[PDB]
Ligand binder design. Structure first.
Ligand SMILES: [Ca+2]
Ligand SMILES: [Ca+2]
Ligand SMILES: [Ca+2]
Ligand SMILES: [Ca+2]
Lengths: 78, 824, 145
């Protein structure tokens, strides 16, 4: 589009953000998960709840396994 | 069974082995083994099925094929002879006092051993009860209470030290609360303990030691609640018994300066001591330390009371050393002694008929010294105390009509009651103070939950029983409903966790007995209150009233219908028998109305409340602020009998219990001589009955009282199976064996971890394994295909399980590696 | 939701995780079974999925929790791909057959004691056509039963 190269002029996972670094945002915009698809992954850590998924509990996992968001980078979230 | 040996009554061992040689209407005739000929009769419901192997023991009594009073007694007996003092019955613990320091079981390495590990995975131990209460406290967010039974010398103290020391070492930052309770115990024992006929050092109050925990489940403090202090002991006792220990400790150990201040003497000189035993406890050495001017005539004649640990002189010094170590000073020590002394003198005040001036009464001349000492010690004026002990005050109206106050002279008997009523209020408030001062040693501002050990005087019956036995046995009947309810709930929850079926369990409820006593308007308690309202209150009228309001009640019968012959001449209006959970108890109703009154009239109530002595005001200075709350409401609660006051306080005990998950320890006392390695069978059996253990064994017969884990049934029967089946793991061994034999589905049930049986079906199972080796061998041959298929699917579905957990790790880590919507 | 007959088969497989017979497991026990069958999870990933089903908070799984611990939003073909992946853990050298030697190795790895003669006895019952080896078609007919 015209708005995509103009927004790019002024100026996606982090584990698989190496292999890349115009042609870079080609396959980044092509394989983008939907809104309703990301709403399934929200019910991931939902033990029970009712739409929610706790506040303090949803954090131990984000620092212990996977692409682990730091303990300092977590304080700048909640 | 059918020729096989049995257990039958024996006077000193409880049960002995024998054979049923004849039968009869209500009796079997048993031929002993040991006597090989000396035959005796025995009621049918008194002989029981015995185990095959009399040399086996088990950690849980449900492993036994028959579970009754006789097999339990023999199981704990064999275990006692190996030093294994602890044995379960389900979740219930049974702790026989060894009377020596058993090595290694109370070590630091053993406390760690039990931490986390659930009940049944470890050997039977008090530590496992402790840990089950903690685990249930934090998970269910529910306060707990371990109810322990047993008379004096049964090891309740040692048991409670083991709980406290386990819970602080495991779940406490330092915390030395167990050591401050023991250092403070001699003080509670003085004002709280007393000599009964059966036990020299006996607690006459429900003590509820409790460790309190914050929101994070960590020890913050301690608390010692107290219930149902026996008030009747204060003013009068039977021979062979005594008042509270403080009185005699003080009459033996006090210095001669103190003896002059308080005007003490030998206990034969005081009304409140002298109707019961007047002797001190002392050995040869301590008798020398007591001055001769303290020894009663009967202590001089008969000599000392003997006990391995009680000593009135030595215990006065140990109590004084206590006061110091807690915090009490020299001023507050003489204070407690001044009120105890003031109670003693009060009792010596007597009365005599007046000159028909609304014929009240007057103080006797001989009792002028009584009044003079009592009054200086209780901070009362002499004249005001003479008027209040001989005259009431009343309104001229009752309704909303206006009425001035008047003075009503009391009769002789009415003045005796007032004098005693003031004595029991004063001692009681003094006891509440001692207990409160113990609690100030380990205080805490705020708490969420608690774990408390509870011991109260157990069920008991003598040759002659009266209102004192009625109240204790009433307290225990309600405590046995609680016990029986919680074991029933524990069983019904175990059959659902294991997945057995709908299987309902039969349950004789004891509510009809508790209703006999405490029902409103028709129970014995309110019929006894009703007699206090008649113009001529009689004990005979009360008793006849009881029999009429309950015509064909299952729990009430006339004295004449007693199985004993000592109650053969008691008339119908001279007693009644109650069918308590533990046994029939013939009560004699003489004096029942007198024992049901301890009301203190307000004029005399207001006299002690506003004493000149600051300390005695402080005994009711909780009552300056708490009457300020009630006062009008507090005067309405002074109209309640000792029967209905007993019910109300007992109901507060039970409500506290109701809101807490309950565990149970049954502390047993193996003998009266305090010696190790002496299992007195008959004494332990009698303990099992009154502690309500036998009642619970009746309950579990209604459900599935026999159960063995798969590993237990594997160890027993692998030797009879082929070498192929013996190689199996315990769970598949049992699954193949249960299917091969083809057992009835209503009798035997294959549960989650254990196989469960109805009454006498573990025995039936055991005979299938031993009576026909050729039949069993053929049934195992017939299931060989099913077993090859079972072993295939076990390993096939286990490999699919690991792959499904591999798929769980990726599926979960796909949303936790697609969380990147946040990072950047 | 699974079948009643599917629950029974996982219940007997749950006994290989729960060796001591207390009806409950930890990551030390369920970890050692995973490692025995070709997998290799670290001491960390399994902590998170324990934390879903365990409502009490303590670190212990009973059977009904173990069922919902491995249950997930599954694709149509996922079910069949897992059954095939199970067969392949049994079949090391990989030629679509399970020999006496290959079945004995999985048995011993899960903690099942048995003679060599007993192993051949199993292979023989599952073996329909009669070539002394278990093909996938026959592996599934035993699983279902
Ligand atoms: Ca286990
Ligand atoms: Ca759990
Ligand atoms: Ca192969
Ligand atoms: Ca084949």
């Amino acid at each position: 589009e015209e708005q995509i190269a103009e927004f790019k002029e002024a100026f996606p996972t982090e584990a698989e953000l190496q292999d890349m670094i115009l042609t870079m945002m080609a396959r980044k915009m092509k394989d983008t998960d939907s809104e309703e698809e990301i709403r399934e992954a929200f019910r991931v850590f939902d033990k029970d709840g009712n739409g929610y998924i706790s506040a303090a509990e949803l954090r131990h996992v984000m620092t212990n396994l996977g692409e682990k968001l730091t303990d300092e980078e977590v304080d700048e979230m909640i | 069974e059918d020729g096989k040996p049995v257990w039958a009554p024996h006077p000193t061992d409880g049960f002995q082995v024998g054979n049923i040689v004849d039968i009869g209407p209500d009796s079997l005739t048993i031929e002993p083994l040991n006597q090989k000929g000396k035959t005796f009769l025995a009621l049918i419901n008194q002989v029981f099925p015995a185990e095959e192997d009399s040399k086996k023991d088990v950690e849980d009594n449900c492993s036994l094929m028959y579970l009754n009073e006789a097999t339990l007694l023999h199981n704990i007996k064999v275990r006692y002879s190996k030093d294994r003092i602890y044995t379960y019955v389900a979740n219930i613990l049974i702790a026989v006092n060894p009377y020596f320091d058993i090595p290694k079981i109370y070590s630091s390495e053993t406390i760690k051993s039990y931490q986390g590990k659930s009940l049944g995975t470890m050997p039977p131990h008090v530590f496992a009860i402790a840990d089950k209460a903690f685990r249930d406290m934090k998970v269910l967010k529910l306060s707990q209470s371990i109810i322990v039974s047993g008379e004096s010398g049964a090891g309740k103290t040692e048991n409670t030290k083991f709980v406290l020391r386990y819970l602080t070492e495991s779940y406490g930052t330092g915390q030395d609360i167990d050591d401050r309770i023991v250092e403070a115990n001699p003080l509670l024992e003085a004002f709280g303990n007393a000599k009964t006929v059966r036990n020299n050092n006996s607690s006459r109050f429900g003590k509820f030691v409790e460790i309190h925990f914050n929101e994070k489940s960590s020890v913050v403090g301690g608390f010692v609640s107290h219930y149902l202090l026996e008030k009747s002991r204060i003013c009068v006792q039977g021979k062979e018994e005594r008042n509270y220990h403080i009185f005699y400790r003080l009459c033996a150990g006090a210095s001669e300066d103190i003896r002059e201040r308080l005007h003490l003497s030998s206990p034969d000189n005081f009304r409140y001591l002298n109707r019961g035993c007047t002797r001190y406890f002392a050995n040869k050495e301590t008798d020398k330390q007591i001055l001769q001017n303290r020894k009663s005539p009967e202590y001089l004649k008969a000599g000392s009371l003997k006990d391995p640990l009680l000593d009135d002189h030595g215990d006065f010094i140990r109590m004084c050393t206590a006061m110091k170590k807690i915090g009490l000073d020299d001023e507050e020590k003489l204070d407690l002694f001044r009120v105890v002394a003031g109670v003693l003198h009060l009792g010596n005040i007597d009365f005599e008929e007046a000159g028909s001036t609304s014929g009240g009464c007057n103080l006797k001349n001989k009792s002028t010294q009584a009044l003079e000492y009592c009054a200086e010690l209780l901070g009362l004026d002499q004249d005001d105390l003479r008027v209040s002990l001989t005259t009431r005050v009343m309104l001229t109206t009752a309704g909303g009509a206006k009425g001035t106050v008047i003075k009503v002279p009391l009769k002789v008997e009415q003045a005796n009651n007032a004098r005693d009523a003031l004595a029991k209020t004063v001692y009681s408030h003094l006891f509440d103070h001692v207990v409160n001062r113990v609690n100030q040693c380990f205080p805490f501002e705020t708490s969420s939950y608690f774990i408390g050990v509870l011991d109260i005087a157990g069920f008991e019956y003598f040759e002659h029983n009266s209102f004192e036995q009625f109240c204790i046995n009433y307290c225990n009947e309600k405590l046995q409903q609680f016990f029986n309810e919680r074991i029933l709930k524990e069983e019904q929850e175990l059959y659902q966790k294991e997945g057995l079926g709908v299987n309902e369990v039969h349950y004789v409820d004891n509510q009809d007995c508790i209703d006999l006593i405490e029902a409103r308007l028709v129970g014995i308690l309110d019929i006894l209150d009703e007699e206090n309202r008649l113009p001529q209150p009689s004990d005979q009228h009360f008793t006849s009233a009881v029999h009429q309001k309950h015509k064909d009640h299952f729990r009430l019968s006339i004295p004449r219908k007693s199985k004993l012959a000592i109650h053969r001449n008691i008339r119908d209006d001279e007693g009644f028998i109650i069918r308590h959970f533990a046994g029939a108890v013939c009560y004699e109703t003489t004096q029942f109305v007198e024992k049901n009154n301890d009301a203190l009239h307000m004029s005399l109530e207001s006299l002690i409340c506003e004493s000149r002595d600051k300390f005695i005001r402080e005994l009711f200075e909780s009552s300056t602020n708490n009457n300020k709350d009630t006062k009008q409401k507090a005067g309405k609660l002074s109209f309640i009998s000792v029967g209905n006051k007993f019910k109300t306080q007992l109901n507060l005990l039970l409500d506290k219990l109701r809101s807490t998950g309950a565990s149970f320890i049954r502390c047993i006392k193996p003998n009266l001589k305090m010696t190790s390695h002496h299992f007195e069978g008959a004494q332990i059996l009698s303990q099992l009955q009154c502690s309500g253990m036998v009642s619970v064994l009746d309950l579990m017969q209604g459900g599935f009282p026999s159960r063995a884990s798969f590993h237990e049934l594997y160890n027993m029967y692998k030797k009879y199976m082929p070498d192929k089946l013996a190689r199996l793991d315990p769970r598949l061994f049992c699954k193949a064996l249960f299917k091969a034999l083809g057992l009835n589905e209503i009798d035997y049930k294959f549960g989650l971890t254990k196989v469960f049986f109805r009454p006498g079906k573990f025995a039936e199972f055991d005979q299938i394994m031993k009576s026909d080796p050729d039949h069993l061998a053929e049934l195992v041959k017939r299931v060989n295909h099913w077993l090859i298929c079972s072993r295939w699917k076990k390993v096939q579905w286990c490999s699919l399980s690991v792959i499904k957990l591999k798929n769980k790790i990726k599926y979960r880590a796909e949303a936790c590696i697609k969380m990147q919507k946040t990072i950047r």
